[PDB]
Amino acid sequence: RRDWENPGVTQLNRLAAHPPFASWRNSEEARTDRPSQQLRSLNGEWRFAWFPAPEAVPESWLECDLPEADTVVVPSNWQMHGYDAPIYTNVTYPITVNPPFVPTENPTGCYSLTFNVDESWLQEGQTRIIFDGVNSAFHLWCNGRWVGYGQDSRLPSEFDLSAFLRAGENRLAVMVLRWSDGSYLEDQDMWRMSGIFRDVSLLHKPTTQISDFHVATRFNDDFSRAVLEAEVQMCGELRDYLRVTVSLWQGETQVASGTAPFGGEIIDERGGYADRVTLRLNVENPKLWSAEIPNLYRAVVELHTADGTLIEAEACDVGFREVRIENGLLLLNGKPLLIRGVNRHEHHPLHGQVMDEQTMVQDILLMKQNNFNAVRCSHYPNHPLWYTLCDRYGLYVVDEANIETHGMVPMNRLTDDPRWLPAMSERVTRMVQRDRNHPSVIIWSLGSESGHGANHDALYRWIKSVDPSRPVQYEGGGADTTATDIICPMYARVDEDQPFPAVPKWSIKKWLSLPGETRPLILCEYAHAMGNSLGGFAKYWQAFRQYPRLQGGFVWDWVDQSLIKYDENGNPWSAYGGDFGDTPNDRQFCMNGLVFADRTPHPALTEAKHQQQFFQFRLSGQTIEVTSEYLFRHSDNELLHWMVALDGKPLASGEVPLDVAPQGKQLIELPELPQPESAGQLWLTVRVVQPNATAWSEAGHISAWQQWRLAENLSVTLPAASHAIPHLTTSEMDFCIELGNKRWQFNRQSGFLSQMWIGDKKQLLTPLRDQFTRAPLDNDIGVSEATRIDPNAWVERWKAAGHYQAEAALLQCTADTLADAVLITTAHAWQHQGKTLFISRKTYRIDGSGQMAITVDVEVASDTPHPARIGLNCQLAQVAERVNWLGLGPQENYPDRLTAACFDRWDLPLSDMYTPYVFPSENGLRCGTRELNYGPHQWRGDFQFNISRYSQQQLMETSHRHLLHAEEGTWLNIDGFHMGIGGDDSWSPSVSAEFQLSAGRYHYQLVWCQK
Amino acid sequence: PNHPLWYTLCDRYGLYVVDEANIETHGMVPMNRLTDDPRWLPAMSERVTRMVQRDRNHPSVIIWSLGSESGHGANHDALYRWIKSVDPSRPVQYEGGGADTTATDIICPMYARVDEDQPFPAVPKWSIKKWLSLPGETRPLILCEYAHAMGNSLGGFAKYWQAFRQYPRLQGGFVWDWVDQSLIKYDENGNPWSAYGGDFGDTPNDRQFCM
Amino acid sequence: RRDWENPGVTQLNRLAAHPPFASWRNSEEARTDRPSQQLRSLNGEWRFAWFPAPEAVPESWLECDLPEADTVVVPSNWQMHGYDAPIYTNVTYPITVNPPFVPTENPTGCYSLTFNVDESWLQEGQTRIIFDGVNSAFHLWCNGRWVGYGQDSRLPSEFDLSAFLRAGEN
Ligand SMILES: OC[C@@H]1[C@H](O)[C@H](O)[C@@H](O)c2nnnn21
Ligand SMILES: [Mg+2]
Ligand SMILES: [Mg+2]
Ligand SMILES: [Mg+2]
Ligand code: NA
Ligand code: NA
Ligand code: NA
Ligand code: NA
């Protein structure tokens, strides 16, 4: 039998799924959640050997260790050890699409372990092995005898080894297949790896044992009273003396306790469950669980004899909370949620898909620090710890079954085929049976992108019947199917409709009100954070606040799926699809995270942080209105910090504690703000600071901010009359202009300021030329490749219109000497196949104060694709250490993604002004900048800018960041205007109309001086 | 599900058919032990899906049934929905777990009396006339099994048909049952006699209860 | 493997269920519902031998007939020929309640049939066998090699025999 090619065999001899066990033999240990002696990790050094196909594995391996086998760490994905290559493919299956068959050349991982088992574990009781995660299927032998088989690589498979083990030394033999019929259900957009990638362990249970237990919590109208219901099930031999006690603890305080013999109520004509019992406990004024206040209790289930002797104990953390949909809204404890969510794949750049405690806590912290309150287990049940941490730290979780069949044509071919229903069910049911007691799980999910099929309907109903405590959602087949309690579209836009046939992505605001639609709307995936992205993120968040039934979404996604490679020297770099010899692959589509693989923030994160703020602000004259968006908590660790600064110079600053009830308001009266004499804009900057450390943040953590423009004094005083007069040197080739030790040279054949001197020293390495293009962002490229041209992507419009080729033709270059200045007038025209794309009409005025006032007027042909930018560039000779600007920052910000940035005096090292996206693109821009300082140079105006050691051309032509080489000098881009960055998705043009450069006639002015 | 020709014959002679999945677990304690067990979902589903996949084209099939006397379990709920999703042209019924659960479009009790209530704990048989108008109830009532025709019986048959006729939402039932399940045995003279439970050495048995 | 004691295995290599087929190669025949050459009944006389459990079936029975075997009509219930006693029971299962296991002593019926298959049925096309009902589970062999397994004694189990049959005698 080839069980891995039969979706009717998903397992053999596998034990039933159940919630987490430890079989404690001391209730105190159970209560306090201390380690259990009855639970042993088999983690550590294992013996591993790779084979090209299961047929190639020697018979001898069952009986004894292979001399050819290495010693490796388990858990691990074996492609992280180098045995074969990890494949990165998005939609297209990494195997031939031929259900239920897999390739005969099926990489086979042979794991074995020689290990000791103590005598006492075999004299009495049941000993089982637990494989938390095996990708994708496996057979298992113990001491040569065959035990069982298993599938579903994201949930634990367990087997009873009691009869196979002997005292002292034993040997496990685990045969792991990379591909199986199960693979067809596991087509998530991630890396395709394999092996024993999650813990292994041994659990000793008594013969008479707790086999299962459910926790439930119901509430009266106001949540001032609750009933905790505990259904307990047992295996073994029923006795009249057997008892079950459930006790509920809060810290060291016994809150409630109940005891009953086995014997459930009559459920039908044949009686009831004699191997079950349900405990009901009253709890008065329970402390309720939420992401805001993750209040927990502890439940201990003790299986014991009448006379008091404990047989075994099981426990779990209990969070008192109700989740329900009512009148179109998702309520947690009767209050309508706003899901500041993010999707999170299980990813590590060194270990692969192997999860460890440290990184999880690192993710959770970082998330909570950036105003996230919900996470989605895209697209499978996670490592069991993850649920415990979300219980404890406080994040709402969507627990998703490990079913995705994206590559099927059409998408539901399997999920509408009744022969696949059993394999699908076990992926849903065994998740539910596992995670149902974790309070952080508030929503169940039937999987990812498998369209909509009868099987989804069956299974949706199955959960509703089995666990009505939680809503079920599912996006497949149009996001609003009969299989979903929630309209959960992916990448639906705020205002724009996208009526795809059969499965349209409506504007979220419009989707709500479609005839007869009543359900809430929470995007399961939105704001595609690929490279320089998250543009127009603020639009979603405005909509979420105005629309009750729009209750948030989950950003895609948390972390770049970039793996670590090494060069010749041993130096490490970040690799994406293709970099392992994987083909077909999908390049950098695996990197879509708000953070880098190492958990460094992308610039987008701060934008998320700002939009997801729990405090809203309004300004009326000098009254600040602080509005809380918390549902349950009082603002008991929050003070408001305000300052008013004139073009960067702090005038008045202040501090007021916040005392805002949830959903409440607080008015703060700013003291008389003493009006300054000199010219400039006044700015108000409030920030919310948390005086005290919490479990998820340090003291002084900033949780929210906002700015307002106050009064403005416009400059009316004339610059001190220029004592001197600049000198023209008309040549046939050059216009040279001299003042003191400053010299400006204009080339007459090209028309651009070609060189500049301070003393004898050259300032420029390439002349000051107009620029109309940028190094395309992942959003500009979309799905376009060299051999898969999508002519609709912004980049492909630009290429075909000649934007990148077009050379400037000079139309007019004249010079005039004035009363106190030298006036240069230029005009240019960029043409391609005799089509004129742009016209640039400039006037340089160099007065006797040594200042050069540039005036640029650009015409853009209405019938050409709107350009990335309208600006000037040049390569500076100088390489300085610090960049100092007055404008939006400190971080990278773009016109459609600058809400998080503040206007101030910013001073950063040069390296900070470059964002190291793994796929290089235009990056580092700062907008609404009025003053830029670089060494001797200053530029004044109202422009956008970036500043780095890399040319747009280098950026364009280099595929990976690590191959970029610092160029001689400093490249400077100064844009009067720059195009939005898009991001609603990364496969079709996503820059909103208001952020495209379509005016046709643009104007910007610059004052370039050396102060 | 029946011999395949049976459906051809009802199609052509004109009889309304109820097609029932091959699922019955009467013996279990409680009756829904397997049908509430997810590890039993697979086996059950094939018994339903394959029925629909074979018989969905016969005009005589007007109602699908999920089986018989198997309590009420989440598997029934899952499958009921399955049918509704694949074939919306036919109502779905199932008696188990009280005759009016969330897995049935039709209140289909077995041996519910016309006037007399039988208020068994958990799974009561109400009088059909009272059953209809219980708070919140709106479905039609058609007995899946009534008027046990065991031996000298069918007393009180007129009461049902008078009730059916008076009450619009009392739309009838199915008598139990058509034919005595007696088998032929022979004595010492090769003379044929009708036999029932226990007459073959079979034990334990339910004697005449097959006829 | 003891598939009859495992509810996760209800069939092996069984073909997808579907409505009544006849594979007519003539529109009119299909329209008037006439008998079809592509649908052959195999009902009639078979070779049958009873056993008290499967472990008691001699391995030779796959390869060639059993001399002890009788000739009986198919379809039938073997209880009606006298090989064991039919059991009448209402609620109480006829077997011990211990799911998914059955009794080790499991009355096993061995059915065999030698039959012709025409040249034209194997040169091209697909040749399946259809068992409209088999109570309660069965394994199938053809010309000695194993084909598959099927459960549910009230719906037809179907198997693709194309690659098992040989021209003439099978
Ligand atoms: O980042 C690529 C994303 C990601 O794979 C999502 O799971 C899916 O909704 C999708 N469809 N098209 N692109 N994507
Ligand atoms: Mg399989
Ligand atoms: Mg996908
Ligand atoms: Mg079986
Ligand atoms: Na809202
Ligand atoms: Na992706
Ligand atoms: Na009526
Ligand atoms: Na009977």
Curated annotation (Swiss-Prot), chain A:
Residues the record lists as binding Mg(2+) 1: 404, 406, 449
Reaction(s) catalysed (UniProt annotation): Hydrolysis of terminal non-reducing beta-D-galactose residues in beta-D-galactosides
Pfam families per UniProt: Bgal_small_N, Glyco_hydro_2, Glyco_hydro_2_C, Glyco_hydro_2_N, LacZ_4
A GO CC term assigned to this protein in UniProt: beta-galactosidase complex
Cofactor entry: Mg(2+); Mn(2+); Na(+)
Effect the entry attributes to changing residue 379 to E/F/K: Essentially inactive unless very rapid purification. Causes very large destabilizations of the transition state
Gene3D superfamilies in the record: 2.70.98.10, Galactose-binding domain-like, Glycosidases, Immunoglobulins
Alphabetically ordered keywords of this record: Glycosidase, Hydrolase, Magnesium, Manganese, Metal-binding, Sodium
EC top class named in words: hydrolase
Annotated GO MF terms: alkali metal ion binding; beta-galactosidase activity; carbohydrate binding; identical protein binding; magnesium ion binding
Regulation: Inhibited by phenylethyl thio-beta-D-galactoside (PETG), isopropyl thio-beta-D-galactoside (IPTG), L-ribose, D-galactonolactone, lactose and 2-amino-D-galactose.
Cofactor detail note: Binds 2 magnesium ions per monomer. Can also use manganese. Binds 1 sodium ion per monomer.
Active site, per annotation: 449, 525
InterPro entries attached to this UniProt entry: B-gal_small/dom_5, Bact_Beta-galactosidase, Beta-gal/glucu_dom_sf, Gal_mutarotase_sf_dom, Galactose-bd-like_sf, GH-type_carb-bd, Glyco_hydro_2, Glyco_hydro_2_AS
NCBIfam families linked: PRK09525.1 (NF007074)
Family note: Belongs to the glycosyl hydrolase 2 family.
Protein name: Beta-galactosidase
Gene source species: Escherichia coli (strain K12)
